[PDB]
Amino acid sequence: GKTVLTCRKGNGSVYQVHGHKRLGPAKLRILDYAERHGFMRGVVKAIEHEPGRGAPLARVEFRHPYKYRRVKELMVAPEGMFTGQSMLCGVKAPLAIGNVLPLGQITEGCIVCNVEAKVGDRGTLARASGDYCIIISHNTETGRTRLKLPSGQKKTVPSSCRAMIGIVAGGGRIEKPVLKAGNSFYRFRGKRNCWPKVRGVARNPVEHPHGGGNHQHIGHPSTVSRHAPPGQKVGLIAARRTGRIRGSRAVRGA
């Protein structure tokens, strides 16, 4: 046979991200001495749109801690951010929408976004259009905090990780029907080469495990093992169950 399309994407030749018009990575500011002992004040200068992303971004301007110069950062904007607003980051920052605080300084039951999973990672959780986390409890003996992720899972992180108060802007994006193949064409223009999609049963036996036959059909169960080699692992991978879901859903993941 020939190589399956799932394996060909791993080479990454014509299937890499389109990033010519992107503005760069969106991160919180570097954790330094000032943020660990006091607070730094910044000003929101502009709200900008980046192709391939749903949530808007904010340009915040700070003063350099040690030099006579200005530092410009690029972050994911929470809902309610406006131009001219003052942003405070540090252990002594107050509790308000748009501030960045250590997780141990936020009262249980608050809504946060842009949460670090490692101290100094500069934000890796709850970054999509309308997502947020919820603080559940603090453990002062071990200095750890418990969070509820947008997927419904619970995670424990060190209390020195930072987070932003509020929810990400741009929510409710997936509620509008697309109605046209042309609209999907423009949506994927800024992400990567992955659309349109051809079904496996419509291909030939040389290309896909589902191809071939005088009728269009899979001839074997479509649930495939976790240990299957690449080129054989297509269909529903290591599925614990199949079919229409009746009742309360279970929590996805491991």
Nearer Cβ to Na ion, position 197 or 226?
197
Cα separation, 66 vs 68, whole angstroms: 7
108 binds, among RNA, Na ion, Mg ion, none (CB under 5 to 8 A by kind): none
66 binding RNA? (CB under 7 A): yes
Does 11 bind RNA (CB under 7 A)? Our answer is yes
Closest separation between CB of residue 94 and RNA, Å? 8
Q: Shortest Cβ distance from residue 251 to RNA (Å)?
A: 9
* Binding status of residue 149 toward RNA by CB under 7 A: yes
Nearer to Na ion (CB atom), residue 53 or residue 210: 210
- Least distance between Na ion and beta carbon 212 (Å): 13
In three-state form (DSSP H/G/I as H, E/B as E, the rest C), the secondary structure along the chain is CCCCHHHHHHHCCCCCCCCCCCCCCCCCCCCCHHHHHCEEEEEEEEEECCCCCCCCEEEEEEECCCCCCEEEEEEECECCCCCCCEEEEECCCCCCCCCEEEHHHCCCCCEEECECCCCCCCCCECCCCCCCEEEEEEECCCCEEEEECCCCCEEEEECCCEEEECCECCCCHHHCCCCCHHHHHHHHHHCCCCCCCCCHHHCCCCCCCCCCCCCCCCCCCCEECCCCCCCCCCCEECCCCCCCCCCCCCCCCC
Q: Does 71 bind Mg ion (CB under 5 A)?
A: yes
Supply the minimum distance, in Å, between the C-beta of residue 105 and RNA.
Answer: 14
| Size of site (CB under 7 A) for RNA | 160
36 binds Na ion (CB under 5 A): no
- Residue of 22, 45, 54, 62 interacting with Mg ion (CB under 5 A): 62
Query: Which residues inside 195-214 make contact with Na ion, applying CB under 5 A?
Result: 197, 199
Confirm or deny that 36 is annotated as ligand binding. no
# chain residues binding Mg ion, by CB under 5 A:
3
User: Measured from the CB atom, is 137 or 199 closer to RNA?
Assistant: 199
Residue 46 CA: distances (Å) to CA of 76, 156, 242 = 12, 34, 47
Binding-site residue positions for Mg(2+): 29
Contact footprint for Na ion (CB under 5 A): 197, 199, 216-217
Residues at the interface with Mg ion (CB under 5 A): 1, 62, 71
Q: Annotated binding residues, as ranges?
A: 29
